[PDB]
Amino acid sequence: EVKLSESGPGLVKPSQSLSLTCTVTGYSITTNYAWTWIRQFPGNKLEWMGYIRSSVITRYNPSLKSRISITQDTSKNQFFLQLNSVTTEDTATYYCARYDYYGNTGDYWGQGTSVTVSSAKTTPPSVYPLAPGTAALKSSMVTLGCLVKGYFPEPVTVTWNSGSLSSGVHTFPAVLQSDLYTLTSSVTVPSSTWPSQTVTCNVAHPASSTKVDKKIVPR
Amino acid sequence: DIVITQDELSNPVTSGESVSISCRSSRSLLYKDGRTYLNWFLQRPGQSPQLLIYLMSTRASGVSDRFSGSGSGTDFTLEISRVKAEDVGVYYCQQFVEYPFTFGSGTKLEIKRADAAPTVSIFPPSSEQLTSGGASVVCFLNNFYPKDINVKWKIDGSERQNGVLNSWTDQDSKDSTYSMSSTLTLTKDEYERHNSYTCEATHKTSTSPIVKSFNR
Ligand SMILES: COC(=O)[C@@H]1[C@H]2CC[C@@H](C[C@@H]1O)N2C
């Protein structure tokens, strides 16, 4: 079917201009559909921003004023979003979607791309291993984990053993502090398996272009 | 413009029962064509919204027949027959009659399940973090129900409240449970000054607090 994917810088300095791209595949954007941009603020409040249709029809949210501009490129099949003079107030996750006449969107939404407006500098995260200090009642489960600390801005994706281990995994919401994010993730496996079979955690921080893999070893 | 109000549910519901979510508009959403433009979406933790119903009572494609909408021109209801654990998340309604296409504040759905006691795991600072001058102690309290929980840290037996940061997850879509991680962060020189560090969790599933601990 159809697929939409938003891309763009996850960090913008206040006063500046924000710019995101939504690349469609499997379907042409030069169709009479409302190719729209929507955003979700911290608190989960959802807001409609605007849309471009039939390549030359654009409508916008009165409230964004005249700092919003929605354009496209038929050759590459992508429409763009541009928002002038952004303030922290604009920090949020941006989703592109395809609405039709009757408000139906189907499964035609992008994965959303997080944008943060701030003056702070991008800082990659430091990954630390969480092993058990001592032993415990084996012949059951063992819980290991990773600690991601001091990264800016959101987000960071954590996967275990390159993603080939998804059950028994728990990744917690990042908490802010001194304008620096920190979060943890746990994973639980049969004691009989660790540390024989090694267990790593991968942390990718797109904002800084870094990816870390950390093996959890016995202390 | 139009103001859409969503009411919160008063209590977690029982699996296999019928649930109703309500949304109200300060302006009628009926259009000159006789159609009522209201959309219902479900958004699960870490996902993009998902259209469920549109045109007030029409099922999006590939959506369970357990979901259905009804209403007037200003009062709407999403009915979920035989609610399943995979249905938790946040339900929003959107008006599609006039600019801007206003969204609803959202309604959260919680599933009732068997009370489970937390699985506590405490971990000490990594040699990597310590060679940095920092030191954090982590404690995971996994897969418990209900969500109400209280954690308490103690250094050398004495209660501590400075440096702790808690992060609760949302209700699991498979086993309906909740999980929390508490992190006690102190400076390295401070950590080398104490020997005992304990994590104490007080849940309804027991009078006595589950206490995990270690000694430097
Ligand atoms: C603000 O204009 C709209 O929402 C239009 C009208 C006409 C049909 C339906 C959807 C359109 O986008 N609306 C009731």
PDB file of C-alpha atoms and ligand atoms in Angstrom, chain A residues 51 53 100-103, chain B residues 29 31 33 37 95-99 101, ligand 1:
ATOM      1  CA  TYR A  51      -2.718  20.799   3.820  1.00  0.00           C
ATOM      2  CA  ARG A  53      -4.170  19.370  -2.419  1.00  0.00           C
ATOM      3  CA  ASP A 100      -9.992  12.771   2.032  1.00  0.00           C
ATOM      4  CA  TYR A 101     -13.275  14.558   1.629  1.00  0.00           C
ATOM      5  CA  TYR A 102     -15.083  12.655   4.376  1.00  0.00           C
ATOM      6  CA  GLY A 103     -12.297  12.851   6.977  1.00  0.00           C
TER       7      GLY A 103
ATOM      8  CA  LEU B  29     -21.475  18.672  13.185  1.00  0.00           C
ATOM      9  CA  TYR B  31     -23.729  19.093   7.340  1.00  0.00           C
ATOM     10  CA  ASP B  33     -25.607  16.974   3.012  1.00  0.00           C
ATOM     11  CA  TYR B  37     -18.501  14.751  10.292  1.00  0.00           C
ATOM     12  CA  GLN B  95     -14.622  17.357  14.231  1.00  0.00           C
ATOM     13  CA  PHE B  96     -14.451  17.572  10.441  1.00  0.00           C
ATOM     14  CA  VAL B  97     -17.093  20.236   9.592  1.00  0.00           C
ATOM     15  CA  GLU B  98     -15.082  23.441   9.708  1.00  0.00           C
ATOM     16  CA  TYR B  99     -11.583  24.865  10.009  1.00  0.00           C
ATOM     17  CA  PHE B 101     -10.447  20.447  12.291  1.00  0.00           C
TER      18      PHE B 101
HETATM   19  C1  LIG C   1     -14.032  23.937   6.330  1.00  0.00           C
HETATM   20  O1  LIG C   1     -14.501  23.170   5.183  1.00  0.00           O
HETATM   21  C2  LIG C   1     -14.636  21.785   5.311  1.00  0.00           C
HETATM   22  O2  LIG C   1     -14.391  21.133   6.334  1.00  0.00           O
HETATM   23  C3  LIG C   1     -15.165  21.086   4.018  1.00  0.00           C
HETATM   24  C4  LIG C   1     -16.733  20.950   4.225  1.00  0.00           C
HETATM   25  C5  LIG C   1     -17.499  20.276   3.048  1.00  0.00           C
HETATM   26  C6  LIG C   1     -17.494  18.758   3.350  1.00  0.00           C
HETATM   27  C7  LIG C   1     -16.710  18.628   4.670  1.00  0.00           C
HETATM   28  C8  LIG C   1     -15.157  18.440   4.432  1.00  0.00           C
HETATM   29  C9  LIG C   1     -14.474  19.656   3.668  1.00  0.00           C
HETATM   30  O3  LIG C   1     -13.076  19.667   3.958  1.00  0.00           O
HETATM   31  N1  LIG C   1     -16.920  19.935   5.329  1.00  0.00           N
HETATM   32  C10 LIG C   1     -18.219  20.062   6.099  1.00  0.00           C
END
